[PDB]
Write a protein that binds this ligand. Structure first.
Ligand SMILES: N[C@@H](CCC(=O)N[C@@H](CSSC[C@H](NC(=O)CC[C@H](N)C(=O)O)C(=O)NCC(=O)O)C(=O)NCC(=O)O)C(=O)O
Ligand SMILES: N[C@@H](CCC(=O)N[C@@H](CSSC[C@H](NC(=O)CC[C@H](N)C(=O)O)C(=O)NCC(=O)O)C(=O)NCC(=O)O)C(=O)O
Lengths: 261, 270
């Protein structure tokens, strides 16, 4: 039996793979100057579900003839703690990738949260979200949905299934049930629509594919697709395959992250 | 006649997971590994431009606060009908509610001010929708807007750790489990520290002006540090040690539209 204290103080507690990285405090841990290249967009990121959203988006824009959507891509190693460097924290004080700088204009604009970066780029160039209120709203319903759902998938299911030191039954069941509910939701939606927000591929599809599409394609945690009965979600699976064959998606996944040190 | 979207105005990990009747505490009857409608339900639709199907939770109060801030700012067209969706009763799985929000979470909003109604779900998206509709509580310049959105999306991506992680394991799980509690308490504290440090530098989360991002953040973190959420949690988290966050939380709690949003009455649907 573990005793719950009145006031929590276990700063040194085991956090699995991210022991040392995870802390009860935020902010800068060391001085860091990040490189800045010539392209309008500087992307400080890593090839994770959240990072690939942004390279995919940029490649989709490039593939549609938006010539300004070129970017410099730099590797932020989250296991090394690069996300706690002074320059990175300036861009994203939450110390998570992806983080972006738009230096197309007079002064650079810092953008973080992967879904927000997708929205920012979509509105800047008028691509991959409808310009009519009804269509825009439905994309946003699902884009925000993804932002609020993925934490359970990655931070709940993924953590306990793959990165916690012991396999803990109760958390795994709790978070697996939620992951399945989410998969079932998306499957049932995609049984009625070509893409998540209707007839047209959108930033919501990019956001959702990067987590749920890769998941059911068995590209994420080892054994997870099988554990979750991924193949049983036929409409989600068919949509994930369709999106995986887009050239911009393939280029987004294959993008080269340059060293910062 | 209800909502009409068409009409005019040591444990062994198995190889494949199998569900169970596993006791999740309070929400065991309700939670399932599938989504969708569970029964037929016609929701009331009133006369006001905004129909809000919700409950007085951290996610729900964001929207009543927003609507009341808009009204307090002179937006006479931001009146609403407010209806109680009981999440313990499973009202969120009724046919009309699922038609507005297939994810079956409150809050969900119908904007029937235009020619056809527009369903809006996700509390943060509802805030953004209302802010853009009326041009208030988000800046119109790109830099100002982007900073608000950074924090609005942040809130949406962070609250699951606070409610679904910390809240659940601290308050709702039948047993107090050490590893989950330490994981999610540490993350909650990181979030509180992050916010405290921002609010030491700025009057509101995105700068000198109050925004939808403050509403979204306050509704969780503000209420949390004011000891209004799970019993013992503010003490457990050392909430009073976050002095800039706590002062900001008090400041916003004193706003008249915030009080009115908290006090709103949720009408019965059945
Ligand atoms: N909502 C943000 C999430 C960004 C994010 O999670 N970034 C991760 C890498 S993506 S890789 C997937 C990621 N895992 C992690 O971040 C692992 C570390 C974490 N501290 C932990 O203990 O779980 C995850 O589950 N995310 C949940 C979600 O998407 O909402 C990161 O930089 N981590 C650095 C750190 O934590 O120090 C967004 O969409 O931009
Ligand atoms: N991202 C959505 C979340 C909305 C939401 O979570 N709504 C809750 C009530 S807010 S009350 C706070 C809420 N808790 C719950 O939803 C409790 C029920 C849940 N199934 C469980 O067992 O954990 C929570 O932790 N939220 C996490 C977050 O905000 O990201 C709901 O309708 N639940 C019905 C259901 O689950 O069937 C939003 O911002 O609108």
């Amino acid at each position: 039996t573990y005793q719950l204290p009145k006031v929590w103080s276990a700063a040194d507690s085991d956090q699995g793979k991210f022991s040392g990285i995870n802390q009860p405090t935020a902010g800068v841990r060391f001085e860091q100057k990040l490189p800045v290249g010539k392209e309008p967009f500087q992307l400080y990121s890593l090839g994770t579900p959240n990072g690939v959203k942004v390279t995919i988006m940029l490649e989709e824009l490039l593939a549609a003839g938006v010539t300004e959507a070129t970017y410099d891509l730099y590797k932020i190693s989250i296991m090394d703690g690069d996300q706690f460097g002074s320059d990175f924290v300036k861009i994203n004080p939450n110390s998570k990738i992806p983080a972006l700088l738009d230096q197309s204009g007079h002064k650079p604009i810092p953008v973080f949260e992967s879904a927000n970066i997708l929205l920012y780029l979509a509105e800047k160039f008028g691509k991959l979200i409808p310009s009519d209120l009804a269509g825009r709203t439905e994309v946003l319903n699902w884009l925000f949905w993804q932002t609020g759902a993925a934490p359970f998938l990655g931070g709940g299911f993924g953590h306990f299934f793959n990165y916690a030191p012991e396999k803990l039954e109760y958390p795994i069941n709790r978070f697996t049930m939620e992951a399945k509910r989410q998969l079932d939701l998306l499957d049932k939606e995609l049984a009625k629509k070509a893409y998540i927000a209707g007839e047209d591929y959108s930033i919501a599809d990019i956001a959702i594919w990067s987590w749920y599409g890769q998941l059911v394609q068995d590209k994420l945690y080892p054994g997870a697709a099988e554990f979750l009965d991924a193949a049983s979600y036929k409409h989600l699976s068919a949509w994930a395959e369709k999106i995986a064959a887009r050239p911009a998606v393939q280029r987004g996944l294959a993008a080269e992250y340059q060293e910062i040190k």
